[PDB]
Design a binder for this molecule. Sequence first.
Ligand code: CLR
Lengths: 151, 52, 48
Amino acid sequence: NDCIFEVKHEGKVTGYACLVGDKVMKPAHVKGTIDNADLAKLAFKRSSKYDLECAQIPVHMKSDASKFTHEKPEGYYNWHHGAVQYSGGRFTIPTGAGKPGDSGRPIFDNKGRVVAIVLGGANEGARTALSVVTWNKDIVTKITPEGAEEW
Amino acid sequence: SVASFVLLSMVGVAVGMCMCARRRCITPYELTPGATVPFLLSLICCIRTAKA
Amino acid sequence: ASHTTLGVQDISATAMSWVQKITGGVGLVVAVAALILIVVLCVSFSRH
Ligand SMILES: CC(C)CCC[C@@H](C)[C@H]1CC[C@H]2[C@@H]3CC=C4C[C@@H](O)CC[C@]4(C)[C@H]3CC[C@]12C
Protein backbone atom coordinates (compact mmCIF):
# COMPACT_ATOMS: atom_id res chain seq x y z
CA ASN A 1 0.00 0.00 0.00
CA ASP A 2 0.90 3.67 -0.49
CA CYS A 3 3.65 3.09 -3.05
CA ILE A 4 2.01 5.62 -5.41
CA PHE A 5 3.58 9.00 -6.21
CA GLU A 6 1.45 11.76 -7.70
CA VAL A 7 2.23 13.33 -11.05
CA LYS A 8 1.08 16.89 -10.87
CA HIS A 9 0.67 19.19 -13.83
CA GLU A 10 0.90 22.90 -13.33
CA GLY A 11 -2.62 23.29 -12.00
CA LYS A 12 -3.89 19.79 -11.28
CA VAL A 13 -2.99 16.13 -10.85
CA THR A 14 -2.69 14.41 -14.23
CA GLY A 15 -1.32 10.96 -13.47
CA TYR A 16 0.34 8.56 -11.07
CA ALA A 17 3.80 6.98 -10.94
CA CYS A 18 4.59 3.73 -9.15
CA LEU A 19 7.66 1.93 -7.83
CA VAL A 20 7.73 -1.60 -9.27
CA GLY A 21 10.75 -3.78 -8.60
CA ASP A 22 13.86 -1.71 -9.20
CA LYS A 23 12.20 0.90 -11.44
CA VAL A 24 9.78 3.80 -11.20
CA MET A 25 7.19 3.64 -13.98
CA LYS A 26 4.77 6.29 -15.23
CA PRO A 27 2.39 6.54 -18.19
CA ALA A 28 4.26 8.34 -20.96
CA HIS A 29 1.07 10.15 -22.01
CA VAL A 30 0.75 11.97 -18.66
CA LYS A 31 2.24 15.48 -18.72
CA GLY A 32 3.34 16.80 -15.35
CA THR A 33 5.98 16.77 -12.64
CA ILE A 34 6.78 13.98 -10.18
CA ASP A 35 5.85 14.88 -6.61
CA ASN A 36 9.26 13.85 -5.26
CA ALA A 37 12.16 16.08 -6.29
CA ASP A 38 14.76 13.28 -6.35
CA LEU A 39 12.58 11.43 -8.88
CA ALA A 40 11.41 14.47 -10.86
CA LYS A 41 15.07 15.45 -11.39
CA LEU A 42 16.27 11.89 -12.08
CA ALA A 43 17.11 11.42 -15.76
CA PHE A 44 14.08 9.73 -17.16
CA LYS A 45 13.50 7.53 -20.22
CA ARG A 46 10.62 7.33 -22.71
CA SER A 47 9.10 4.56 -24.85
CA SER A 48 6.04 5.40 -26.96
CA LYS A 49 5.58 1.88 -28.35
CA TYR A 50 4.21 0.71 -24.99
CA ASP A 51 3.28 4.25 -23.85
CA LEU A 52 5.50 3.72 -20.82
CA GLU A 53 7.92 6.03 -19.10
CA CYS A 54 10.70 4.47 -17.00
CA ALA A 55 13.51 5.31 -14.64
CA GLN A 56 15.70 3.31 -12.29
CA ILE A 57 14.74 3.59 -8.62
CA PRO A 58 17.37 5.10 -6.29
CA VAL A 59 17.13 1.90 -4.26
CA HIS A 60 19.46 3.25 -1.56
CA MET A 61 16.62 5.45 -0.27
CA LYS A 62 13.53 3.84 -1.91
CA SER A 63 13.24 0.40 -0.30
CA ASP A 64 9.42 0.47 -0.29
CA ALA A 65 9.01 -0.40 -3.98
CA SER A 66 6.21 -2.85 -4.67
CA LYS A 67 6.85 -6.43 -5.75
CA PHE A 68 5.62 -7.81 -9.07
CA THR A 69 4.60 -11.03 -10.80
CA HIS A 70 4.08 -11.89 -14.46
CA GLU A 71 1.56 -14.69 -13.85
CA LYS A 72 -2.02 -13.85 -14.84
CA PRO A 73 -4.39 -16.55 -13.57
CA GLU A 74 -8.08 -16.10 -14.28
CA GLY A 75 -10.13 -14.29 -11.67
CA TYR A 76 -10.36 -11.28 -9.40
CA TYR A 77 -7.68 -8.70 -8.56
CA ASN A 78 -7.45 -5.31 -6.77
CA TRP A 79 -7.47 -1.81 -8.38
CA HIS A 80 -7.67 0.77 -5.54
CA HIS A 81 -11.18 1.26 -6.89
CA GLY A 82 -12.82 -2.14 -6.50
CA ALA A 83 -12.32 -5.59 -7.93
CA VAL A 84 -11.10 -6.12 -11.49
CA GLN A 85 -12.14 -9.32 -13.24
CA TYR A 86 -9.32 -10.70 -15.38
CA SER A 87 -11.15 -12.84 -17.93
CA GLY A 88 -9.67 -14.23 -21.11
CA GLY A 89 -6.98 -11.80 -22.17
CA ARG A 90 -8.86 -8.77 -20.85
CA PHE A 91 -9.54 -6.90 -17.63
CA THR A 92 -13.11 -5.82 -16.84
CA ILE A 93 -14.05 -3.09 -14.37
CA PRO A 94 -17.33 -1.63 -13.11
CA THR A 95 -18.01 1.33 -15.38
CA GLY A 96 -18.16 3.87 -12.55
CA ALA A 97 -14.86 2.92 -10.90
CA GLY A 98 -12.36 4.63 -13.19
CA LYS A 99 -12.01 8.19 -14.43
CA PRO A 100 -9.62 9.94 -16.84
CA GLY A 101 -6.57 11.31 -15.06
CA ASP A 102 -6.33 8.25 -12.79
CA SER A 103 -3.91 6.38 -15.06
CA GLY A 104 -0.78 4.86 -13.54
CA ARG A 105 -2.40 3.03 -10.64
CA PRO A 106 -1.19 -0.60 -10.64
CA ILE A 107 -3.37 -3.69 -10.37
CA PHE A 108 -2.66 -5.88 -7.34
CA ASP A 109 -3.04 -9.63 -7.07
CA ASN A 110 -4.36 -11.25 -3.89
CA LYS A 111 -0.77 -11.38 -2.57
CA GLY A 112 -0.21 -7.62 -2.85
CA ARG A 113 1.95 -7.97 -5.97
CA VAL A 114 1.66 -5.73 -9.02
CA VAL A 115 0.43 -7.62 -12.08
CA ALA A 116 -0.40 -4.84 -14.55
CA ILE A 117 -0.57 -1.05 -14.87
CA VAL A 118 -3.71 0.65 -16.16
CA LEU A 119 -2.97 2.96 -19.08
CA GLY A 120 -6.61 3.56 -19.97
CA GLY A 121 -9.98 2.04 -20.64
CA ALA A 122 -12.84 1.63 -23.07
CA ASN A 123 -16.48 2.47 -22.39
CA GLU A 124 -17.64 -1.11 -22.77
CA GLY A 125 -21.33 -0.89 -21.82
CA ALA A 126 -22.32 -2.83 -18.70
CA ARG A 127 -18.62 -2.68 -17.80
CA THR A 128 -15.45 -0.96 -18.94
CA ALA A 129 -12.55 -2.74 -20.61
CA LEU A 130 -9.16 -1.96 -19.10
CA SER A 131 -6.25 -1.22 -21.43
CA VAL A 132 -3.18 -2.08 -19.37
CA VAL A 133 0.55 -2.72 -19.57
CA THR A 134 1.56 -6.16 -18.32
CA TRP A 135 4.66 -8.31 -18.68
CA ASN A 136 5.68 -11.85 -19.47
CA LYS A 137 8.69 -13.53 -17.86
CA ASP A 138 11.15 -11.29 -19.76
CA ILE A 139 9.22 -8.74 -21.85
CA VAL A 140 6.44 -6.18 -21.46
CA THR A 141 3.27 -6.08 -23.55
CA LYS A 142 0.33 -3.69 -23.79
CA ILE A 143 -3.28 -4.90 -23.88
CA THR A 144 -5.51 -2.47 -25.78
CA PRO A 145 -9.18 -3.45 -26.08
CA GLU A 146 -10.86 -1.94 -29.12
CA GLY A 147 -12.39 1.49 -28.64
CA ALA A 148 -10.09 2.39 -25.76
CA GLU A 149 -9.66 6.15 -25.41
CA GLU A 150 -6.81 7.83 -23.57
CA TRP A 151 -6.88 8.35 -19.81
CA SER B 1 -3.84 -7.64 -78.92
CA VAL B 2 -4.91 -11.26 -78.46
CA ALA B 3 -1.68 -12.16 -76.66
CA SER B 4 -1.88 -9.08 -74.44
CA PHE B 5 -5.50 -9.85 -73.56
CA VAL B 6 -4.68 -13.49 -72.81
CA LEU B 7 -1.70 -12.60 -70.62
CA LEU B 8 -3.60 -9.89 -68.74
CA SER B 9 -6.49 -12.32 -68.20
CA MET B 10 -4.04 -14.92 -66.88
CA VAL B 11 -2.57 -12.35 -64.48
CA GLY B 12 -6.07 -11.38 -63.33
CA VAL B 13 -7.03 -15.02 -62.80
CA ALA B 14 -3.81 -15.56 -60.84
CA VAL B 15 -4.42 -12.61 -58.50
CA GLY B 16 -8.12 -13.39 -58.08
CA MET B 17 -7.55 -17.02 -57.17
CA CYS B 18 -4.70 -15.94 -54.92
CA MET B 19 -7.35 -13.84 -53.17
CA CYS B 20 -9.56 -16.94 -53.07
CA ALA B 21 -6.75 -18.93 -51.43
CA ARG B 22 -6.25 -16.06 -48.97
CA ARG B 23 -9.94 -16.09 -48.04
CA ARG B 24 -10.02 -19.87 -47.62
CA CYS B 25 -6.88 -19.89 -45.48
CA ILE B 26 -7.97 -16.89 -43.40
CA THR B 27 -11.70 -17.38 -42.71
CA PRO B 28 -11.24 -20.16 -40.09
CA TYR B 29 -8.97 -17.87 -38.07
CA GLU B 30 -11.55 -15.07 -38.30
CA LEU B 31 -14.21 -17.48 -37.04
CA THR B 32 -12.27 -18.71 -34.01
CA PRO B 33 -12.54 -16.37 -31.00
CA GLY B 34 -9.24 -15.02 -29.73
CA ALA B 35 -7.84 -14.90 -33.28
CA THR B 36 -4.23 -15.58 -32.26
CA VAL B 37 -2.92 -15.37 -35.82
CA PRO B 38 0.86 -15.92 -35.89
CA PHE B 39 2.82 -12.89 -37.03
CA LEU B 40 4.51 -14.79 -39.86
CA LEU B 41 1.15 -15.90 -41.26
CA SER B 42 -0.15 -12.33 -41.02
CA LEU B 43 2.86 -11.13 -43.02
CA ILE B 44 2.47 -13.87 -45.64
CA CYS B 45 -1.27 -13.41 -46.21
CA CYS B 46 -1.16 -9.61 -45.68
CA ILE B 47 -3.92 -9.33 -43.08
CA ARG B 48 -4.83 -7.09 -40.17
CA THR B 49 -5.46 -8.42 -36.68
CA ALA B 50 -8.84 -8.12 -34.98
CA LYS B 51 -7.42 -7.65 -31.47
CA ALA B 52 -5.01 -4.84 -32.50
CA ALA C 1 43.52 18.80 -80.14
CA SER C 2 42.73 15.89 -82.45
CA HIS C 3 41.04 13.90 -79.67
CA THR C 4 37.55 14.70 -78.44
CA THR C 5 36.37 16.06 -75.11
CA LEU C 6 35.57 13.39 -72.53
CA GLY C 7 32.80 13.04 -69.96
CA VAL C 8 32.80 12.56 -66.21
CA GLN C 9 32.98 8.76 -66.14
CA ASP C 10 35.54 8.49 -68.95
CA ILE C 11 38.65 9.98 -67.33
CA SER C 12 38.20 8.00 -64.14
CA ALA C 13 40.51 4.97 -64.81
CA THR C 14 42.08 3.42 -61.66
CA ALA C 15 40.67 6.25 -59.56
CA MET C 16 37.36 4.73 -60.64
CA SER C 17 38.77 1.37 -59.59
CA TRP C 18 39.41 2.97 -56.18
CA VAL C 19 36.03 4.67 -55.76
CA GLN C 20 34.55 1.28 -56.58
CA LYS C 21 36.27 -0.17 -53.50
CA ILE C 22 35.32 2.79 -51.29
CA THR C 23 31.68 2.87 -52.42
CA GLY C 24 31.41 -0.90 -52.12
CA GLY C 25 32.68 -0.89 -48.55
CA VAL C 26 30.61 2.05 -47.36
CA GLY C 27 27.47 0.82 -49.13
CA LEU C 28 28.09 -2.58 -47.57
CA VAL C 29 28.08 -0.86 -44.18
CA VAL C 30 24.82 0.84 -45.19
CA ALA C 31 23.30 -2.48 -46.30
CA VAL C 32 24.31 -4.15 -43.03
CA ALA C 33 22.70 -1.28 -41.12
CA ALA C 34 19.55 -1.64 -43.24
CA LEU C 35 19.42 -5.38 -42.55
CA ILE C 36 19.84 -4.80 -38.81
CA LEU C 37 17.11 -2.16 -38.79
CA ILE C 38 14.76 -4.37 -40.82
CA VAL C 39 15.25 -7.41 -38.59
CA VAL C 40 14.78 -5.25 -35.49
CA LEU C 41 11.55 -3.82 -36.92
CA CYS C 42 10.30 -7.30 -37.82
CA VAL C 43 11.04 -8.54 -34.30
CA SER C 44 9.39 -5.45 -32.80
CA PHE C 45 6.10 -6.09 -34.60
CA SER C 46 6.09 -9.65 -33.23
CA ARG C 47 5.79 -8.34 -29.65
CA HIS C 48 2.19 -7.09 -29.64
C1 CLR D 1 38.43 9.30 -54.81
C2 CLR D 1 39.79 9.64 -55.42
C3 CLR D 1 40.83 8.59 -55.03
C4 CLR D 1 39.71 9.77 -56.95
C5 CLR D 1 38.58 10.65 -57.46
C6 CLR D 1 38.93 11.28 -58.80
C7 CLR D 1 37.85 12.19 -59.42
C8 CLR D 1 37.31 13.16 -58.39
C9 CLR D 1 38.44 12.87 -60.66
C10 CLR D 1 39.01 11.81 -61.63
C11 CLR D 1 39.61 12.64 -62.78
C12 CLR D 1 38.50 13.68 -62.92
C13 CLR D 1 37.61 13.84 -64.14
C14 CLR D 1 38.24 13.43 -65.46
C15 CLR D 1 37.44 13.96 -66.61
C16 CLR D 1 36.42 14.81 -66.50
C17 CLR D 1 35.59 15.17 -67.70
C18 CLR D 1 35.64 16.66 -68.04
O1 CLR D 1 34.68 17.00 -69.02
C19 CLR D 1 35.36 17.50 -66.81
C20 CLR D 1 36.25 17.11 -65.64
C21 CLR D 1 36.14 15.62 -65.25
C22 CLR D 1 34.71 15.32 -64.78
C23 CLR D 1 37.16 15.31 -64.13
C24 CLR D 1 36.65 15.75 -62.74
C25 CLR D 1 37.28 15.12 -61.49
C26 CLR D 1 37.57 13.63 -61.68
C27 CLR D 1 36.28 12.83 -61.88
